[PDB]
Swiss-Prot record:
Consequence of substituting residue 147 to A: No effect on enzyme activity. Decreases affinity for damaged DNA
A GO biological process held by the record: RNA repair
Binding site for 2-oxoglutarate: 106-108, 190-196
Record field: catalytic activity: a methylated nucleobase within DNA + 2-oxoglutarate + O2 = a nucleobase within DNA + formaldehyde + succinate + CO2
Record-given protein name: Alpha-ketoglutarate-dependent dioxygenase AlkB
Essential cofactor(s): Fe(2+)
Chain ranges of the Fe2OG dioxygenase domain: 99-199
């Protein structure tokens, strides 16, 4: 059970093929790279962005930047398929006003994980985050306000869209090591799109 979170399973099933074609298109301008945390450690999850702003690691910490620090060019524009799905998802969740300007694209190879963290780099915490899962299934784990808070698990499969609004927006969360397997559309990985209001 989650407060403020609206889970729309298999919502992105029909849009899925075009989203993957558009992830590949975004990836040809801003390649997938495994970002280095401020402490000097490379993340197992490969990331890239699209939209006006993009989430990235820096020496001083985490920030949103209109420039890709690797290519030194701006991030690719948010694809229309991305805009359309997020809009329909947010409207179905009770957020018709949500206008994202950043989309963090995560690629999970077999065994890739994402340790517990909070999404607190956005200016307005009242605004939700629309998450779209594609490819192989992954176990999403969420806690509470603190670190040693009781963890709950959720499987996020292909096409699943979760809108993290209300209280769930500030919860500690992460992804457990991706189980090896096969998916017809992504072959051996999982993709996750997190639409954010970063400006
Ligand atoms: O992959 C997921 O479903 C979660 C991604 C996430 O929380 C993030 O990148 O900040
Ligand atoms: Fe996150």
């Amino acid at each position: 059970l989650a407060a403020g979170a609206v889970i729309l399973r298999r919502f992105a099933f029909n849009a899925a093929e075009q989203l993957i074609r558009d992830i590949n298109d975004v990836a040809s301008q801003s390649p997938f790279r495994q970002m280095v945390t401020p402490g000097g450690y490379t993340m197992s999850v490969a990331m890239t962005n699209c939209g006006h702003l993009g989430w990235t690691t820096h020496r001083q910490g985490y920030l949103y930047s209109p420039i890709d620090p690797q290519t030194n060019k701006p991030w690719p524009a948010m694809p229309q398929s991305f805009h359309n799905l997020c809009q329909r998802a947010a409207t179905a969740a009770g957020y018709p006003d949500f206008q994202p300007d950043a989309c963090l694209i995560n690629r999970y190879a077999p065994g890739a994980k994402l340790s517990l963290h909070q999404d607190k780099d956005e200016p307005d915490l009242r605004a939700p985050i629309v998450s779209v899962s594609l490819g192989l299934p992954a176990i999403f784990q969420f806690g509470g306000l603190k670190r040693n808070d009781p963890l709950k698990r959720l499987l996020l499969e292909h096409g699943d869209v979760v809108v993290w609004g209300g209280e769930s927006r500030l919860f500690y969360h992460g992804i457990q090591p991706l189980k090896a397997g096969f998916h017809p559309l992504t072959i051996d990985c999982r993709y996750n799109l997190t639409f954010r209001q970063a400006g």
